[PDB]
Amino acid sequence: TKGTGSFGKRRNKTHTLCIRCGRRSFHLQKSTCSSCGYPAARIRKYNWSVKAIRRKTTGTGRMRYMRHVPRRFKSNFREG
Amino acid sequence: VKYSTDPANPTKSAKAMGRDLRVHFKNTRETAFALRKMSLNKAKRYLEDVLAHKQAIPFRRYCRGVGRTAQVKNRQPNGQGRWPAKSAKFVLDLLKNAESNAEVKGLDVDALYISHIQVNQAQKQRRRTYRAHGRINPYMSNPCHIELILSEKEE
Amino acid sequence: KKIKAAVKKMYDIQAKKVNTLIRPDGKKKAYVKLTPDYDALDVANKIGII
Amino acid sequence: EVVTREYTVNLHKRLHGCTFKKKAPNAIKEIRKFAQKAMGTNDVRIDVKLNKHIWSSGIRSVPRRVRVRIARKRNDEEDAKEELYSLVTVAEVPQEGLKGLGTKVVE
Amino acid sequence: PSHKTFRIKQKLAKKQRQNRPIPYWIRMRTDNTIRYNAKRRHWRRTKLGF
RNA sequence: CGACUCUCGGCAACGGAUAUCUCGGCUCUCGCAUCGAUGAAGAACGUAGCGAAAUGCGAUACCUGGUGUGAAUUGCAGAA
RNA sequence: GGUGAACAGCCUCUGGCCAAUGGAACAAUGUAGGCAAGGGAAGUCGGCAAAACGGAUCCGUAACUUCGGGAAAAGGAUUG
RNA sequence: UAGGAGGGCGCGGCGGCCGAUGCAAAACCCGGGGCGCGAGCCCGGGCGGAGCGGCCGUCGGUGCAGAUCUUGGUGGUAGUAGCAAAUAUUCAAAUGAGAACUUUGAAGGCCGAAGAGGAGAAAGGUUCCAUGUGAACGGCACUUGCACAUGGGUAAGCCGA
Ligand SMILES: [Mg+2]
Ligand SMILES: [Mg+2]
Ligand SMILES: [Mg+2]
Ligand SMILES: [Mg+2]
Ligand SMILES: [Mg+2]
Ligand SMILES: [Mg+2]
Ligand SMILES: [Mg+2]
Ligand SMILES: [Mg+2]
Ligand SMILES: [Mg+2]
Ligand SMILES: [Mg+2]
Ligand SMILES: [Mg+2]
Ligand SMILES: [Mg+2]
Ligand SMILES: [Mg+2]
Ligand SMILES: [Mg+2]
Ligand SMILES: [Mg+2]
Ligand SMILES: [Mg+2]
Ligand SMILES: [Mg+2]
Ligand SMILES: [Mg+2]
Ligand SMILES: [Mg+2]
Ligand SMILES: [Mg+2]
Ligand SMILES: [Mg+2]
Ligand SMILES: [Mg+2]
Ligand SMILES: [Mg+2]
């Protein structure tokens, strides 16, 4: 029946880890990540959820390269 | 650290405490109300005799549903009482610890008596039980603070 | 391949066989079985394990 | 006091009306209570041979009269609730059966 | 599965290390607020979701 | 007399309101214009003598180097 | 493994268990299981529920029929 | 009553004025004393341990008993309902502070091989193994555990990808 009898057959994984975003949203049968939009060229982002945008906008990660850009603007991109 | 009631004479009275004891508050209250103002030795006899399921602790305030016994006719005529063993075994430990305190102070452990006994509620602990139709309800304990003072009786 | 090539350059020994597994903790663990010309106790004493 | 006595426990009457899944456990409990009435001793140890005998015929049919010997002896354990306890063991039956055999006292 | 891909093995390795009580010397460290590991995970309660 | 109930005070509990705060928020204003195939944003995994998180960093891995200041770090030990 | 048509039920061997909180009592009403004198559906909307029949061998097997069935009809006997 | 207006009480700021405060401020508690018809105010005592009040002008996220109001806590119900499927446990001994629940042995039983046995797929992700245990958890209990803590363990030319 629906419900308790039918929740026992959740056995196969519809979604697996995307490689672009690390979320468990990669629909295997369809081969597209359901959060970042992978393998689309551009990231899936929509203005109907600013809450979803802020969770993955710029600044939520390391910013391994842009964190140094202000310091390099100061002194105007100098190398000796 | 100070008890609800100060002793009649502080230097000649021993005192013992326990906080957040995992025992039923209602059962232990019903124990204490039988043990108030008893001699210490008779209190040990009585309470160990209770844990030995041979004399019964009357239940008066928290009593509704408690079955009847003949073992408690002398003190509650309608004979409504139980033998709360965990409560008794926890109270024995404090009676012994206060006997030890009085021994260390130097009192007459033969002449000590229950001058003041008080049980009081504590912070409940939370557990969950699962019911029909996917509902849960809390399943919580009622731990108690047990607080007692033995004093030496006087003429 | 690199494990044998490296155990040859260090320790001045050679490995008859090598087995590798990945531990649950993340690091790879390798079992290096020596040719019988070389003695594991002597190598392990020349490095200090026992 | 040390003393050993042979009893015949009419264990059919004591166990009339009991539930099948409990006639043998209550046979053990009745052996204990019979030793307790016999010598006022709280501590009763039933020997494993007596247990084996009672439990021989299953859990729902027990021997009807059992010839036991109960031995009140000292508890030499330095810690002890009672100075003296009782050890009940199965008793040898004469070839005569249980006819005319009352309680005896074994030297 | 006993047949797990290396990605899942590598990423289950880390969630092993992610599950340990805080070092005791964290608590004595000055101007500290860490009272316990508030990110522990038990295998019967919280499924990793992957 | 006593138990039960109702009730008043004293004391004790449960609970965390109020009172005083605040390395936080919000609001307004001003200055500047600087991501990325020379591989960005994001993600993953690693990395400390004793570390899980967060902060940092990348097999040179809680850092290398120059400059500046000028005698520390700090929860413990240690080389200094 | 035995019975048995049989991977039915029932019992045992290898292997595994006695884990489902226990003590006392046997009141009403319950849940599950039975048995009942004479009658035999009168009960009830209604044979609902239960009881009865049930394997096998031998004999016998109606109306109707699409001539294939009905049919394991019905009705009897036997069984260690 | 619906409604309208006037005069006031009270909370929190700002511009001013007058003050209080470690010889005890704010808050809160009181069978304490009073004032006002009343909103409310003043004093006393206790806890408290660092701020606070009054008057004038003015400003506002300004006054609660209700909204099956929102968040948090607490009651009576109540030691009540209850803990009942899967036949079943019993006795010595050992450990232990403590044993109906641990371990050994013995006895009785069940699963009865389309199993309550031995292994796998997916799924879980360290539950596996050892040693130790204060708490919590295992809807009774526990020396015990699938719990907590520290360690260890998964080896492939041939089994799979
Ligand atoms: Mg399907
Ligand atoms: Mg699908
Ligand atoms: Mg459910
Ligand atoms: Mg391999
Ligand atoms: Mg046959
Ligand atoms: Mg069969
Ligand atoms: Mg009849
Ligand atoms: Mg009818
Ligand atoms: Mg009729
Ligand atoms: Mg009628
Ligand atoms: Mg009709
Ligand atoms: Mg029917
Ligand atoms: Mg017909
Ligand atoms: Mg408002
Ligand atoms: Mg309000
Ligand atoms: Mg309100
Ligand atoms: Mg109103
Ligand atoms: Mg009840
Ligand atoms: Mg039930
Ligand atoms: Mg088969
Ligand atoms: Mg199996
Ligand atoms: Mg284990
Ligand atoms: Mg429990």
Short mmCIF file of N, CA and C (backbone and C1' of nucleotides) in Angstrom, two decimals, chain D residues 21 25 28 32 44-48 51-52 55 58-59, chain H residues 87-94 98 105-109:
data_model
loop_
_atom_site.label_atom_id
_atom_site.label_comp_id
_atom_site.label_asym_id
_atom_site.label_seq_id
_atom_site.Cartn_x
_atom_site.Cartn_y
_atom_site.Cartn_z
N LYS D 21 3.07 -24.34 31.15
CA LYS D 21 4.37 -23.70 30.97
C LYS D 21 4.98 -23.26 32.30
N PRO D 25 8.63 -24.93 36.81
CA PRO D 25 9.18 -23.83 37.62
C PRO D 25 8.51 -23.70 38.97
N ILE D 28 9.89 -26.22 41.30
CA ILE D 28 11.13 -25.76 41.93
C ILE D 28 10.82 -24.77 43.05
N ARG D 32 11.59 -25.15 47.11
CA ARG D 32 12.19 -24.12 47.96
C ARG D 32 11.28 -23.78 49.13
N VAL D 44 18.08 -21.61 50.54
CA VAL D 44 17.88 -22.98 50.11
C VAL D 44 18.57 -23.14 48.77
N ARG D 45 19.48 -24.10 48.68
CA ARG D 45 20.10 -24.44 47.41
C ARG D 45 19.58 -25.79 46.94
N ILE D 46 18.98 -25.80 45.76
CA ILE D 46 18.50 -27.02 45.14
C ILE D 46 19.62 -27.60 44.30
N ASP D 47 19.97 -28.85 44.55
CA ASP D 47 21.06 -29.48 43.82
C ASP D 47 20.66 -29.70 42.37
N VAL D 48 21.65 -29.61 41.49
CA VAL D 48 21.40 -29.76 40.06
C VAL D 48 20.84 -31.13 39.73
N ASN D 51 17.18 -30.68 40.30
CA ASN D 51 16.60 -29.95 39.18
C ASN D 51 16.45 -30.86 37.97
N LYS D 52 17.49 -31.64 37.66
CA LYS D 52 17.44 -32.55 36.53
C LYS D 52 16.29 -33.54 36.68
N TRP D 55 12.87 -31.81 36.15
CA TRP D 55 12.71 -31.37 34.78
C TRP D 55 12.82 -32.51 33.79
N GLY D 58 9.74 -33.19 31.18
CA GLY D 58 9.23 -32.01 30.52
C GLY D 58 8.83 -30.93 31.50
N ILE D 59 8.20 -29.90 30.95
CA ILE D 59 7.80 -28.73 31.73
C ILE D 59 6.36 -28.83 32.21
P U H 87 7.63 -18.89 20.27
"O5'" U H 87 6.94 -19.55 21.54
"C5'" U H 87 6.02 -18.81 22.32
"C4'" U H 87 5.34 -19.67 23.35
"C3'" U H 87 6.26 -20.31 24.37
"O3'" U H 87 5.56 -20.42 25.61
"C1'" U H 87 5.12 -22.00 23.20
P A H 88 5.70 -19.27 26.71
"O5'" A H 88 7.22 -19.35 27.15
"C5'" A H 88 7.58 -19.37 28.52
"C4'" A H 88 9.03 -19.69 28.71
"C3'" A H 88 9.95 -19.33 27.55
"O3'" A H 88 11.19 -18.86 28.06
"C1'" A H 88 10.11 -21.65 28.00
P U H 89 11.32 -17.35 28.59
"O5'" U H 89 11.02 -17.45 30.14
"C5'" U H 89 12.01 -17.90 31.05
"C4'" U H 89 11.74 -19.31 31.50
"C3'" U H 89 12.59 -19.83 32.64
"O3'" U H 89 12.14 -19.40 33.91
"C1'" U H 89 12.56 -21.42 30.92
P U H 90 13.20 -19.00 35.05
"O5'" U H 90 13.66 -20.40 35.63
"C5'" U H 90 12.71 -21.28 36.21
"C4'" U H 90 13.32 -22.63 36.47
"C3'" U H 90 14.64 -22.63 37.22
"O3'" U H 90 14.51 -22.43 38.61
"C1'" U H 90 14.82 -24.06 35.38
P C H 91 15.61 -21.54 39.37
"O5'" C H 91 16.75 -22.59 39.71
"C5'" C H 91 16.43 -23.92 40.09
"C4'" C H 91 17.66 -24.75 40.28
"C3'" C H 91 18.85 -23.98 40.81
"O3'" C H 91 18.80 -23.86 42.21
"C1'" C H 91 19.51 -25.28 38.94
P A H 92 19.88 -22.98 42.99
"O5'" A H 92 21.08 -23.99 43.20
"C5'" A H 92 22.37 -23.51 43.49
"C4'" A H 92 23.44 -24.42 42.94
"C3'" A H 92 24.79 -23.76 42.79
"O3'" A H 92 25.51 -23.74 44.01
"C1'" A H 92 24.25 -24.89 40.80
P A H 93 26.00 -22.34 44.60
"O5'" A H 93 27.30 -22.02 43.74
"C5'" A H 93 28.34 -22.98 43.64
"C4'" A H 93 29.21 -22.74 42.45
"C3'" A H 93 29.77 -21.34 42.31
"O3'" A H 93 30.90 -21.12 43.14
"C1'" A H 93 28.96 -22.08 40.22
P A H 94 31.23 -19.64 43.67
"O5'" A H 94 31.81 -18.91 42.39
"C5'" A H 94 32.94 -19.44 41.72
"C4'" A H 94 33.27 -18.63 40.49
"C3'" A H 94 33.23 -17.13 40.69
"O3'" A H 94 34.42 -16.63 41.27
"C1'" A H 94 32.04 -17.69 38.74
P G H 98 27.95 -7.83 46.12
"O5'" G H 98 26.56 -7.63 45.38
"C5'" G H 98 25.43 -7.20 46.11
"C4'" G H 98 24.48 -6.41 45.25
"C3'" G H 98 23.92 -7.13 44.04
"O3'" G H 98 22.83 -7.97 44.37
"C1'" G H 98 24.65 -4.98 43.41
P G H 105 29.69 -24.03 28.14
"O5'" G H 105 29.20 -25.13 29.17
"C5'" G H 105 30.14 -26.04 29.73
"C4'" G H 105 29.62 -26.71 30.97
"C3'" G H 105 28.30 -27.44 30.83
"O3'" G H 105 28.47 -28.72 30.24
"C1'" G H 105 28.30 -26.16 32.81
P A H 106 27.34 -29.32 29.28
"O5'" A H 106 26.17 -29.71 30.28
"C5'" A H 106 26.40 -30.64 31.33
"C4'" A H 106 25.24 -30.69 32.28
"C3'" A H 106 23.86 -30.87 31.67
"O3'" A H 106 23.59 -32.20 31.30
"C1'" A H 106 23.77 -29.18 33.29
P A H 107 22.71 -32.50 29.99
"O5'" A H 107 21.24 -32.07 30.42
"C5'" A H 107 20.53 -32.82 31.39
"C4'" A H 107 19.23 -32.17 31.79
"C3'" A H 107 18.25 -31.88 30.67
"O3'" A H 107 17.52 -33.02 30.27
"C1'" A H 107 18.41 -30.00 32.08
P G H 108 16.88 -33.07 28.80
"O5'" G H 108 15.67 -32.04 28.87
"C5'" G H 108 14.58 -32.24 29.75
"C4'" G H 108 13.63 -31.08 29.71
"C3'" G H 108 13.10 -30.72 28.34
"O3'" G H 108 11.98 -31.51 27.98
"C1'" G H 108 13.91 -28.77 29.37
P G H 109 11.55 -31.62 26.44
"O5'" G H 109 10.98 -30.18 26.12
"C5'" G H 109 10.79 -29.77 24.78
"C4'" G H 109 10.75 -28.27 24.66
"C3'" G H 109 10.90 -27.73 23.26
"O3'" G H 109 9.68 -27.77 22.56
"C1'" G H 109 12.30 -26.52 24.72
#
